[PDB]
Every structure is written in C-alpha cells, then in structure tokens.
Design an enzyme around this catalytic site. Structure first.
Site, short mmCIF file in Angstrom:
data_model
loop_
_atom_site.label_atom_id
_atom_site.label_comp_id
_atom_site.label_asym_id
_atom_site.label_seq_id
_atom_site.Cartn_x
_atom_site.Cartn_y
_atom_site.Cartn_z
CG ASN A 40 127.49 25.15 -81.59
OD1 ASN A 40 127.80 25.51 -82.72
ND2 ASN A 40 127.30 23.88 -81.28
CE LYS B 151 123.90 22.71 -81.56
NZ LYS B 151 122.97 21.68 -80.99
CG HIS C 89 128.65 19.56 -80.74
ND1 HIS C 89 127.52 18.94 -81.23
CD2 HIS C 89 128.22 20.58 -79.96
CE1 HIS C 89 126.45 19.57 -80.76
NE2 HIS C 89 126.85 20.56 -79.99
CD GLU D 61 124.30 19.11 -83.14
OE1 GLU D 61 123.37 19.41 -82.37
OE2 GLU D 61 124.98 19.97 -83.75
CD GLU E 62 127.64 18.67 -76.56
OE1 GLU E 62 128.27 17.67 -76.96
OE2 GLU E 62 127.12 19.48 -77.34
N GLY F 44 119.01 20.11 -77.58
CA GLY F 44 117.91 20.54 -78.44
C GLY F 44 116.57 19.86 -78.20
CB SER G 211 117.70 22.13 -73.30
OG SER G 211 117.39 21.36 -74.45
CG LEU H 109 128.27 24.27 -76.34
CD1 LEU H 109 129.11 25.34 -77.00
CD2 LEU H 109 128.85 22.89 -76.63
N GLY I 196 123.14 26.31 -77.58
CA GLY I 196 122.79 26.06 -78.96
C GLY I 196 121.66 26.93 -79.49
CG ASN I 197 118.07 25.11 -81.15
OD1 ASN I 197 119.06 24.40 -81.32
ND2 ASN I 197 116.97 25.00 -81.88
#
Lengths: 246, 246
Positions: free
Chosen positions: B8, B10, B93, B95, B163, B169, B209, B228, B230-231
């Site tokens: 993702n 983002k 999600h 966010e 999640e 994050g 994370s 899933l 992210g960063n």
C-alpha cells in the site's frame, strides 16, 4: 584522464572457453596508449590468458595477500606477482568482503603491499542496500576511502571503483545520475585530503551490472572514468563496452 | 491457503521513483500461482504502475466509492474500476476511517458495490490503543467484522486485514503472539457465522509496521496469511518481505 575498462572474469572459465573469448577480444582494434583495458582471469588461468591475449591488453589477478612471502598456505604475495610481471591486482571487491571477511584493514594492508612491490591496484568500495535506504551512502563511502587514501603516492597507479553492492550481478544498475553524484563526492574527498591535481588524475570507475546497453550513458558522466565489468565480460559482446570508452 | 502480500503505497511517489521501484520489484522471481502480490499505487499513478510492473504482480486502488456512477465529484465507482480491469480495492483502511469519516456502514456498502462488480476486496479493521487498554479488542473487532461478513459470497475474493491502529506507521508492531490470538478469534467468528470450509479458505492478513526483520516470525503464525505493508513497501528491500512468504 585515460579511460579504464576492467574485465573481472571472477570464478569462471575453461581452457577452451578462454581461447574462444580471447580470440574475439583480440579482434578489437584499439590504442592502449589512449585507453586501458585490463583482464583479470582466475589465478591458475593467468599464464594461459596472458599468452592468448595480445600485448595491447593488460592483465592482473583478482586478489593478493596482505602478508609477504612466508607460511600463508593458499595466498599469493605481491612479491610473487611482481616476479611474474603481473601488472594489476583487484583489492577489496565486494565478494571478498562478503563471503570472506575482508575488512578495511585488510584492504589498506593489501594496497600497501601492492604499491610497495610496484603493482597497480584497482580498489573497490560501495554501500549495501540497507545503508542506502538509511541515507548513509556518503558516510559509508567516505569511511571506506579514508581507510586507505593516504597510502596513494602515484595517482595513475591506483584506480578506485564505486561498487554499489545492490547493483552487483543483480541487473539493477545505478542510473547515470546516481553514480555521477557519488563519483563527484569521492573525487572531492580526494581533492580535499590529497590535493586537486591528484584528484583530477585519479580514475574512478563504476561497477555493477554494466552492459552493452547502459555503458554509453554511464561513461558520458563527468566523473565516471570507466568500469569494472563482471558477467558482461564473459561474453564476446564485451568488445562493445570497450568501444563505448574509445 | 495462498499467502497474500499487499503493498500500500498510500499517498507517495513520483513517475521517476515508481520507475526505480518497479524495476527492483520486477527482479524478484516468484510464482503468482503460489503467492499473491498486489501493489496499490495512487489513483493517478495506476496506468503508469500497471505498465511498468510485470504481469506476475497484481494491482488495485486504495479506495472505491460506496455509490455507483453519477454525480459524485471526486469519487471512483466500482463500475469504472471494472471497466479498467482493476483487480483489487482496499476498503475500510484506518486512515479513511480516521481522517475521513468512513464508518462500518460505508465499509459494507463499498464491499457490496465491489463484489457486485466482481472486484476483489481487501477489507481492514482494528482497534485503537484506548480500546485495547480497556480490553475491548475482541468486542470491537467482532462488531467491525459482523458489519459486513454476511456479504461475502466467494471466500477467495475477499481478504481480511487486522490493522491495530496503534501499530500503523508507528514502529510498534504487534508481537507474533498478540496478532495470532486476534487472527484465531477472527477466523472463529467467520467459522461460526459462515461455515468451517469458508473460514479455512479466507485469508486474514496482519498490517502495522511490518518490516524485513519481523515479517518472518509473523507469517509463521498459523492464522496469519500475509500482510498489508505500508512504509516498508516504498523501499526496494520490500522484496525480502515478499520472500518471507514464499
């Protein structure tokens, strides 16, 4: 400065495959006083390769000992190399630092031994993917160069090689922009620690998945003076890479 | 069941950074019939990314409308996504629930719209730190799942994502033990409300994370079927996370 192209055959080859390859290499017409082209065969293949290759090609070995002559089973000393008139040696290649535990200390001692015996050296360094993603590239590179830069007395006899570890044999070459940035910073380090004249005469090559398609754009960069070619040097098409530098 | 790894991105990326990243991703040799790897670029980056990425990689969008085609400025409908052959969509999600006011009602309507248009969906849910400290984790999770679980008709086309909000994050990943407990309870909810066969085929991923260092221990857990990411998916090292699942 004189461009420099090095063929690092690493651990590959047979007496027959070398005969076929040297044959193609010999067909390339180039002036050795305008371009340096060095081939590094496996140690036990040195005599065979030196004989097959025309004098326009220079040759060397892929590693040298940090010790002198003596009780060091399996090692080749700089004194022995000079006795055989071996012109170049590669020092600090990623594979020796990785699979073998060669450190910056070994790199500096091997360079000192080489220069002491009038051997020309190709010194390698570079950052790992992890270091790059942490933005430590320049910090790591600076430390590696500083580990041996004071030993350089003749800036025509030592050639630097920026080898990003993530680009070695992976196919993910550094872009011209990426490489240029790093090379510029390396030369500045030399300029500031050794002198401007010295910095302008030393060759800094790029190594890491160089091929016939990307070599032209790379050599065009102001601070890239040639390359250390691995897998692409085991092919007859290697001659086109040499052509990009002439 | 088939492991699932989702990238993702983002709200990040440029045409150039995506070219460099997709390049590294393409170098990873993996079998798409044994592992699902989906990349979710920003909407305006979809065509560019789909083109650069090899067919072994699946792609999708980070959000979809709960409405159909019509007067809904700024939204992308499921019908439009299907027309473009976009395979996956992320729904619910954290966010979007946080910064935007997406509720469980929006999550269920978006899923209904997606399944109706034969889109595969990655549905997210999880508890906040406050809820966890009050020991309401399972109560909150159960409510969130029950909000849409009856809509699932094909258990291979809907992927659940646990999640925990406090792990997104922040760097504070849930321990393998923590995640496993929650995932086990989620599958039991599905088993009891939908059926055992269904429960055993649906993928439940962990998000929050996940990195190259902790991914191995997490995927090893019996009820964690992938992640899933992210960063960590904005880095070339993301390939190592994919490797942990093959």
């Amino acid at each position: 400065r004189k461009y420099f192209v090095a063929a690092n055959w690493k651990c590959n080859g047979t007496l027959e495959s070398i005969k076929s390859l040297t044959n193609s290499f010999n067909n390339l017409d180039f002036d050795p006083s305008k371009l340096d082209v060095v081939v590094f065969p496996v140690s036990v293949h040195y005599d065979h390769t030196r004989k097959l290759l025309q004098s326009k090609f220079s040759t060397g070995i892929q590693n040298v000992s940090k010790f002198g002559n003596g009780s060091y089973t399996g090692e080749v000393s700089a004194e022995i190399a000079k006795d055989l008139n071996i012109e170049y040696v590669i020092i600090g290649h990623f594979e020796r630092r990785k699979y073998f535990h060669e450190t910056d200390e070994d790199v500096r001692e091997k360079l000192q031994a080489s220069l002491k015996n009038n051997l020309k050296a190709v010194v390698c360094f570079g950052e790992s993917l992890e270091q790059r993603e942490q933005n430590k590239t320049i910090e790591v590179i600076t430390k590696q160069v500083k580990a041996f830069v004071d030993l350089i007395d003749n800036f025509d006899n030592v050639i630097l090689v920026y080898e990003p570890l993530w680009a070695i044999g992976t196919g993910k070459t550094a872009t011209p922009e990426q490489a240029q940035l790093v090379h510029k910073e390396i030369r500045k380090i030399v300029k500031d620690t050794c002198g401007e004249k010295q910095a302008n005469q030393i060759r800094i090559l790029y190594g890491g998945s160089v091929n016939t398609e990307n070599c032209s754009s790379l050599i065009q960069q102001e601070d890239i003076d040639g390359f250390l070619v691995g897998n692409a040097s085991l092919k007859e098409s290697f001659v086109d890479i040499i052509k990009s530098a002439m």
